[PDB]
Amino acid sequence: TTYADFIASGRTGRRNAIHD
Amino acid sequence: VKEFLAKAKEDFLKKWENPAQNTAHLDQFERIKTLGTGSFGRVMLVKHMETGNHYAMKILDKQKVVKLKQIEHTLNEKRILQAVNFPFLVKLEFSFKDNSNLYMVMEYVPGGEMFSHLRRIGRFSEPHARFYAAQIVLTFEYLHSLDLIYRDLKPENLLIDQQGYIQVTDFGFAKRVKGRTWTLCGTPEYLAPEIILSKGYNKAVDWWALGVLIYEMAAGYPPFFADQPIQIYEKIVSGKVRFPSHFSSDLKDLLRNLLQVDLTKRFGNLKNGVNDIKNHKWFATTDWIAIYQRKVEAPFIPKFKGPGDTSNFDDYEEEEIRVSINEKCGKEFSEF
Ligand SMILES: N[C@H](COc1cncc2nc(-c3ccncc3)ccc12)Cc1c[nH]c2ccccc12
């Protein structure tokens, strides 16, 4: 399930913003 | 509305032209906890003696700001923030500086981050997602109306006050722009196509980010995610979105038009402005006037157990606030 793939991914935490 | 926004433009404009300064000192507040940390700063839950109130205090390391070339954005943050005012925006009570830091004492939002809730919970019922969207929707109407592009919308940035409403924070990328802008910034997963495809862009990106928010509030995950940024940007500019089974028909609709790569067809940047959003099927059950007046039925009341309680925020290693014996970035921040 997409939901599954999401949790195994290292992007389920507080996502930081991009600068330079 | 029209009658309202105008009044608001004059109010904003007046504050914007002669922005306040040095409205307090660090030693007037009492450190309590670190509600968030990051790049060049951290935000603490602080107590103000004289009145006994609480506030979140964004602390910016002047030198850490200079290194990341954020001087211009930090000035926008304070300037816009003190000049703005709206039922769903964190009030900026105080702001000042010293030899080492920049300070922005905001109103404390005992509820915690939306993000924190949407993850523990998983996803939100459409009625719950829609409740929040609407608010973000009006707020974007307010902002845009003042030639302001928020540029950094994300669950990690929406707080929930006692009544269960949104409190937009982080104006680090807020910028007062009339016309195209190129400053590349924001959080990956919410980046608009234009922004990644370095082609100059306008408010149209605040609506794309909006569509992204809603998707994530209603699905539990972003419509565009992967393990590394490149991967994700590649999904956004691809122009291929995939919706879950439980997304009503209307919703899939509203989303299709917001996550529109074609910005001459993207709901918001169109001829009818923001009404294309307020007058959509998925929003019909919404009474925009009721929302502005905080009289709607909050679908989730984040409850805290007492002023200063912080069980709704995660924990962060407490650090120290040291101010060198010498001024650090004088003229680079002279107008803060
Ligand atoms: N994405 C996050 C930004 O979070 C924030 C930015 N601005 C105001 C904020 N206010 C609060 C806040 C305000 C009032 N009551 C409760 C919480 C929480 C987070 C904020 C984390 C972060 C990344 N880089 C930073 C640099 C400095 C401070 C925070 C961060």
> B169 with B155: CB under 8 angstroms?
no
Distance CA(B201)–CA(B204), nearest Å, equals 7
Question: Hey, CA dihedral for B75, B33, B136, B92, is it positive or negative?
Answer: negative
Per-domain residue ranges for chain B? Answer: 1-18+113-303, 19-112+304-334
Q: Is B222 annotated as a binding-site member?
A: no
Classify residue B113 by its DSSP letter. B
Neighbours of B149 (CB within 10 A): 21
Distance of alpha carbon B151 from alpha carbon B138, whole angstroms: 16
Residue B106's beta-bridge partner residues? Answer: B56, B92
Cα dihedral B98→B317→B310→B137 (10° resolution):
70
Closest CA to B143 of B153, B131, B156: B153
Q: For residue B1, with 0-12 CB atoms within 10 Å meaning exposed, 13-18 middle and 19 or more buried, which class applies? A: middle
CA distance linking residue B77 with residue B90, whole number of Å = 12
Report the chain B residue with the minimal C-alpha distance to residue A8. Answer: B227
CATH architecture of B1-18+113-303: Orthogonal Bundle (1.10)
Specify whether the CB–CB gap between B230 and A13 falls below 8 A: no
Protein residues with CB under 6 Å of any ligand 1 atom: A 16; B 35-36, 38-43, 56, 58, 90, 106, 108-109, 156-157, 159, 169-170
Chain centre to alpha carbon of residue B82? 15
Closest listed residue to residue B223, CA positions, set B252, B186, B202: B252
Catalytic-labelled residue, pool B152, B161, B170, B206: B152
Q: Strands, E, within B254-322: which ranges? A: none
For residue B201, the 8-state DSSP code is B
- Dist. CA B49–CA B270, nearest whole Å: 49
Tokens of B297: 């039925």
CB-CB contact of B131 with B299 (8 Å): yes
* Torsion, CA B25, CA B30, CA B34, CA B35, rounded to 10: -90
Q: Collect all residues of chain B within an 8 Å Cβ-Cβ radius of residue A20.
A: 68-69
Q: Using an 8 Å Cβ cutoff, are B104 and B19 in contact? A: no
B152 is catalytic: yes
B19-112+304-334 shares the fold of B1-18+113-303: no
How far apart CA B223 and CA B263 sit, in angstroms, is 18
Of the candidates B155, B2, B19, B24, which has an alpha carbon nearest to the alpha carbon of residue B95? B24
HEC profile for B20-43? CCCCCCHHHEEEEEEEEECCCEEE
- How many Å apart are CA B60 and CA B173, to the nearest integer? 14
Q: Please, what CATH class does the domain formed by B19-112+304-334 belong to? A: alpha beta
Determine the distance from the C-alpha atom of residue B143 to the mean position of all C-alpha atoms in its chain, rounded to a whole number: 11
- Structure determined by: X-ray
Tokens 């992007």 locate to A11
The resolution of the experimental structure, rounded to one decimal in Å, is 3.0
3-class SS string, B166-196: EEECCCCCCEECCCCECCCCECHHHCCHHHH
**DSSP for residue A18:** B
What b/e string do you get for B35-60 counting C-beta neighbours within 10 Å, with b at 16 or more? bbeeebbbbbbbbbeeeeebbbbbbb
- Cα dist. B28→B48, B94, B317 in Å? 6, 11, 23
Tell me the two tokens of residue B82: 């003190």
Six-digit token string for B77: 């943050």
